[model samples]
Target: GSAGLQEKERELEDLKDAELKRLNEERHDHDKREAERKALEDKLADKQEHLDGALRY
Candidate 1:
């Protein structure tokens, strides 16, 4: 009886661990996408400024 209870507890703990790992991976991916978006925005701003300067000349 004790062995069965321990096995169930272990299974529950494993499930929780797996869920946490999945959430963490998702968070990491979101952070990476945000960083890429910001970089693209910065590049776009720079290109816009260059075009504006050229137009003024």
Candidate 2:
């Protein structure tokens, strides 16, 4: 029943009109945690140090 006709039909679909517009407009987190995210980013970057830039070079 399934040996040679292994082909399949692939299609795409979009969300409904109301949901599509609303979700697309609210798909962001930066506006909510810009301060917190940026603050922690700098803290994590401090843990990175270079051996060559310290004394070897």
Candidate 3:
């Protein structure tokens, strides 16, 4: 029946939306972690530069 088919299609679409939402959340978390790691790396580089300059004395 058309009604049965329609219901199944709707259910499939809902499942797809749920999966997409989960993936989007995971991506957001990964991006935040990457940004934090990059900041730490930059800080370390700056500290190394300062130490190198001090050693020239």
Candidate 4:
């Protein structure tokens, strides 16, 4: 195959009068990836928090 159907289905999802509604339904397929995305992004938030704390002196 050329690629994951995850990539393939999205090509079709965009073809019709469709948009983010497809995205909302599609994402739950990988529960932990979403969780990990937030986890890593939150790490950056906490990192900036530490920088702010040091700057506030």
Candidate 5:
């Protein structure tokens, strides 16, 4: 009985650790993608502005 209880406890802890790792990875990926998107948007906006200015001449 004691061994079974210990094994269950270990399994529960492992499950919790795995869940935490997955959530953290998801959060990191989301943040990274958001930053990349913003950078691309900024670059595109700058290019468009430059093109518009050149066209005005």
Candidate 6:
């Protein structure tokens, strides 16, 4: 019946909002992890350079 249609509409709207919220959170987490990885890589490179210099001397 027509009454059921309104219920379906509300359900779909809620689902859409939930999906969008999850996507945004995922994007925020991905960016944060990427930045952390880059920082760690930079630190490792700096340490390697120090070790290399010590070996040469």
lDDT by residue for model 2 (1-57), tens: 265455432222233566778777875655667867777778667666777576854
Candidate 5 regions with alpha-carbon error over 4 angstroms: 1-25, 43-57
lDDT of each: 0.78, 0.62, 0.78, 0.67, 0.77, 0.77
TM-scores of the candidates in the order shown: 0.35, 0.25, 0.35, 0.25, 0.35, 0.36
Which has the better lDDT: candidate 1, or candidate 2? 1
Any runs in candidate 6 off by more than 4 Å, and if so which?
A: 5-7, 27-57
- For model 4, the stretches where C-alpha displacement exceeds 4 angstroms are 1-29, 43-57
Candidate 5: how large is its RMSD? 8.8
The alpha-carbon deviation from the true structure for residue 41 of candidate 2, after best TM-score superposition, in angstroms, is 6.6
Off by over 4 Å in 3: 1-7, 27-57
lDDT of 6 by residue, 3-54 (tens): 6755466678889999999997797888899989998778666544444456
Among all windows of ten consecutive residues in candidate 6, which has the lowest summed lDDT?
44-53
Q: What is the per-residue lDDT of model 3 for residues 1-57, given as tens digits with 9 covering 90 to 100?
A: 596755477678889999999997797889899989998778666544444566675
Q: What is every candidate's alpha-carbon RMSD to the true fold?
A: 9.1, 8.2, 8.2, 12.1, 8.8, 8.0
Q: Residue-wise lDDT of candidate 5 within 1-57, one digit each (tens)?
A: 695755466678889999999997797788899988998778666544444456675
Ten contiguous residues minimizing lDDT sum, candidate 1: 44-53
TM-score of 6: 0.36
What is the C-alpha local distance difference test score of candidate 6?
A: 0.77
Q: How close is candidate 2 to the true structure, as a TM-score?
A: 0.25
Cα error, residue 53 of model 1, in Å, equals: 21
Model 1, TM vs. native: 0.35
Better of 1 and 6 by TM-score: 6
TM-score of 3: 0.35
